[PDB]
Design a protein around this ligand. Structure first.
Ligand SMILES: Cc1cc2nc3c(=O)[nH]c(=O)nc-3n(C[C@H](O)[C@H](O)[C@H](O)COP(=O)(O)OP(=O)(O)OC[C@H]3O[C@@H](n4cnc5c(N)ncnc54)[C@H](O)[C@@H]3O)c2cc1C
Ligand SMILES: Cc1cc2nc3c(=O)[nH]c(=O)nc-3n(C[C@H](O)[C@H](O)[C@H](O)COP(=O)(O)OP(=O)(O)OC[C@H]3O[C@@H](n4cnc5c(N)ncnc54)[C@H](O)[C@@H]3O)c2cc1C
Ligand SMILES: c1ccc2[nH]ccc2c1
Ligand SMILES: c1ccc2[nH]ccc2c1
Ligand SMILES: c1ccc2[nH]ccc2c1
Ligand SMILES: c1ccc2[nH]ccc2c1
Ligand SMILES: c1ccc2[nH]ccc2c1
Ligand SMILES: c1ccc2[nH]ccc2c1
Ligand SMILES: c1ccc2[nH]ccc2c1
Ligand SMILES: c1ccc2[nH]ccc2c1
Ligand SMILES: c1ccc2[nH]ccc2c1
Ligand SMILES: c1ccc2[nH]ccc2c1
Ligand SMILES: c1ccc2[nH]ccc2c1
Ligand SMILES: c1ccc2[nH]ccc2c1
Ligand SMILES: c1ccc2[nH]ccc2c1
Ligand SMILES: c1ccc2[nH]ccc2c1
Ligand code: NA
Ligand code: NA
Lengths: 413, 413
């Protein structure tokens, strides 16, 4: 009678997909390796800035439960320190987003969606799932998906070397969730601070388990002055190192932080990983097959702020493919084509752009970013491209095309 | 109080946009150069095969008025004549679409949407609009759009030479709407017949003013054996020349046509045009500005079946941009950014792919099309790519990437 879907991994993409499937009349089994409460009170996992298109995917499913309470992010700003004048910027501009972005802590969203999943009839099973659970799921369900993010079981899927130009981390990452930051005026924004040869500091308002906050995101070229977390062993030390980066590299941002505190002692993170794309179909010892979802198959560095946007868009594409398939077999071909539509239609572009941004920038890029400060339509294109990075091609990557786009923008300024 | 939008040109994109704007509470003025009835009873304009994503845009607006009555197109087929054996094919395969396509004659859809537009409160003005009407609209409306398709006033917009690699027609076109064709079994499809060095014949079921039909689409390399319409001066002669092409080049299709008749004497068309992209902002003598929509700014050869899909997607992107803008100015910068989002996010890919397909194919393409006949997942990717041609990049265009995609497909077959 009823089609039955198993999802291993209770994360953003898995739960969005599972909730959509329940609403469409499927039976859904989901495995989680943590309780909701331990997720709420555990370490942060991301900075999860979702732009309008991803937000709308959630709205269309009825899952925008924090829309009113979560602060809106209304623009993007970009600043570059002056090579000469201390504490001055040589580039400093901003542009409004055509529609707001929002960052709802996954510590809030994932547990609440787990609650909703059970209320809507999903079967939530608690276990650190392994091969045995995948073998069991594939015998009792029409389709089994792995949605375990950066978890170890994700390595069941073969690395796709041609889609993975990097095999090492390209940035040392850290997150710091704080209260008390002076609000940005006259509108909120993701404040991008690009430190040439050193790294990046991004900061924006968000909602966490103690209410509204701002999230500080730090990325450092490995071995550089912002690869600076190895000796940090306490929350107090993490807050202090966060303020040290701002004092040292972005004193204009330190002026907003004279009174910041951590939201909670678990509102901190540091780590690193190599960008990786994996093949989406994994074969179990039995010969049965499972399909990878979102970060299991496409894992990008957070520098472009796309992971949670990718997660929403991936789960949307997979849900649409399931609903269209009907009673057709969920075989390896269908699985692969489902991933291919996500990859070739969308994620290949997000991934190529993110991987290029991790490398040292060519000269036409500096000209582009500086020109944006004098050409508001170009600044606007930069800001709104974060909602659909396909719109950056080819002009972000090619000098001649970048000059042509600057000219188009200047002509309507 | 109310924002007011003028649209010059009562075509598919203009009417979809106008109806969406009325539903959102805007005042809309629209200019048409023909009455609804003369459109219904006049010459056909297109073959308007719309794939699922475009169909869903219409559904989401409540405009899928023919969904139940229009025959569904459930797949794509590809056939290539054998160079040796007479009347045989060396390639002949098909694949199912993940969701049906539909072709509702614009002679039906445009007049019915004009009726709906008036019923929903739009102001429909009948005049062959010129500069004077654009000058008048721009004084009395917040935003004026030109949606006149292949009409002469579209030339108010400057040709974009960098986005327009062609300045001459690349195919001699013809359309023939017929009754009596044997239905394709066991499922309907767009039957692609590629005649190397000569042209293309496509055929699929559709709905017109006399009910269900099939549409024959002919494209001929200029000066070749299928550039064969210049001496056709009557409907009877047009039907006969249509059957001659099938008898001569695709006798397997002629077997379905032993009993075909025209749906009506105006169910025929022949012509040609150069693919053209235009700059989207036009400046009137007064200095006020107007924004071009759909075929006014991006006009592709029909060979890839995308014009009406582009029209729906363009009007969707423009409607979303208007709704997000609120009371912000509809200035040249906003106009340009609205087009840019359509172009860089979507249409640049449809356009580049369509323009490459008009040129003689490189060897890796023949290998790809032949391999699809032995690799069903690749045939499926080919078919479903017509719903989002971004999914064809880069593997349709690059030999090495084409070989990699064939390998991915063969591994899950
Ligand atoms: C520092 C940092 C900052 C980021 N900032 C942003 C940002 O600003 N914007 C943005 O869009 N993205 C951002 N991201 C990325 C984004 O958070 C992720 O890409 C997103 O969470 C991916 O969703 P997912 O559903 O694939 O995985 P997740 O949401 O991580 O879900 C995976 C879940 O599976 C569980 N799991 C693992 N193994 C198992 C197992 N064996 N059995 C059962 N369950 C298991 C895990 O516990 C976890 O809860 C950031 C990431 C990092 C690291
Ligand atoms: C032979 C052929 C086959 C095709 N087959 C397909 C297919 O299979 N699939 C597909 O998706 N697309 C196909 N197309 C393309 C598709 O039909 C068009 O791209 C689509 O109609 C574009 O919509 P539009 O709204 O931009 O223009 P239209 O829908 O053409 O609307 C333009 C309207 O503006 C009116 N107008 C012109 N000048 C003025 C003026 N001065 N004042 C007022 N009104 C004016 C015109 O009379 C017309 O009604 C085909 C095209 C051709 C020529
Ligand atoms: C170019 C522009 C700005 C810069 N700040 C520090 C180095 C450097 C180089
Ligand atoms: C190790 C790594 C990074 C650092 N930045 C400043 C001091 C320092 C030490
Ligand atoms: C939005 C945009 C870019 C970003 N980089 C890191 C976090 C983040 C959020
Ligand atoms: C994806 C594809 C086909 C399917 N048949 C039953 C469930 C299911 C999921
Ligand atoms: C966002 C993130 C990193 C970047 N490096 C250069 C531009 C840029 C934008
Ligand atoms: C193109 C290539 C490499 C790059 N690194 C940062 C921006 C950028 C653009
Ligand atoms: C992020 C977004 C767009 C961009 N264009 C050039 C560099 C770059 C970085
Ligand atoms: C290659 C394949 C098929 C063909 N039919 C006619 C010429 C030709 C060339
Ligand atoms: C002119 C053009 C094309 C043609 N195909 C067959 C005869 C003929 C004449
Ligand atoms: C669908 C797909 C391709 C096509 N080429 C011409 C008409 C047509 C319809
Ligand atoms: C597009 C953009 C801004 C606008 N303000 C009023 C109407 C309108 C349309
Ligand atoms: C559709 C239309 C034209 C084409 N030429 C080669 C492949 C192909 C597909
Ligand atoms: C790449 C380049 C040119 C082409 N002509 C027909 C198919 C095709 C693909
Ligand atoms: C149409 C669609 C996809 C394609 N891949 C190679 C040629 C070609 C034509
Ligand atoms: Na300043
Ligand atoms: Na046959």
């Amino acid at each position: 009678h009823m089609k039955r879907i198993a999802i291993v991994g209770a994360g953003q993409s898995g739960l969005q997909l599972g909730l959509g499937l329940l609403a469409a009349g499927y039976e859904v089994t989901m495995f989680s390796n943590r309780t909701g409460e331990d997720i709420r009170r555990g370490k942060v996992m991301s900075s999860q800035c979702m732009f309008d298109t991803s937000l709308q995917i959630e709205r269309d499913l009825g899952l925008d439960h924090w829309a009113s309470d979560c602060p809106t992010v209304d623009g993007i700003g970009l600043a570059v320190p002056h090579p000469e004048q201390k504490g001055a910027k040589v580039i400093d501009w901003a542009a409004r987003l055509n529609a707001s972005a929002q960052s709802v802590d996954q510590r809030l969203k994932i547990p609440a969606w787990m609650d909703e999943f059970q209320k809507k009839g999903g079967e939530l099973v608690f276990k650190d799932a392994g091969i045995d659970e995948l073998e069991a799921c594939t015998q009792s369900h029409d389709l089994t998906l792995v949605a375990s993010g950066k978890g170890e079981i994700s390595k069941l899927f073969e690395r796709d070397a041609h889609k993975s130009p990097y095999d090492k981390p390209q940035r040392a990452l850290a997150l710091t969730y704080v209260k008390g930051m002076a609000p940005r005026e006259p509108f909120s924004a993701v404040c991008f601070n690009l430190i040439p040869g050193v790294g990046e500091y991004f900061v924006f308002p968000a909602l966490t388990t103690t209410g509204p906050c701002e999230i500080m995101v730090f990325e450092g070229v490995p071995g550089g002055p912002m690869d600076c977390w190895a000796d940090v062993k306490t929350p107090e030390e993490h807050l202090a190192r966060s303020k040290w980066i701002l004092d040292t590299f972005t004193p204009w941002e330190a002026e907003r932080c004279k009174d910041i505190e951590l939201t909670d002692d678990n509102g901190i993170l540091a780590g690193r990983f190599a960008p990786t794309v994996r093949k989406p179909v994994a074969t179990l010892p039995s010969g049965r097959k499972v399909l990878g979802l979102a970060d299991v198959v496409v894992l990008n560095d957070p520098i472009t702020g796309q992971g949670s946007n990718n997660a929403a868009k991936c789960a949307d594409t997979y849900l649409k493919s399931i609903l269209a398939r009907g009673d057709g077999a969920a075989d390896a071909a269908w699985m692969q084509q489902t991933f291919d539509r996500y990859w070739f239609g969308y994620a290949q572009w997000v991934t190529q752009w993110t991987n290029m941004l991790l490398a040292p920038p060519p000269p036409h890029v500096l000209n582009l970013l500086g020109s944006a400060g004098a050409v508001p339509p170009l600044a606007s294109a930069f800001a709104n491209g974060f909602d659909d990075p396909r719109t950056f091609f080819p002009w972000f990557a090619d000098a001649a095309e970048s000059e042509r786009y600057i000219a188009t923008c200047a002509a309507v300024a």
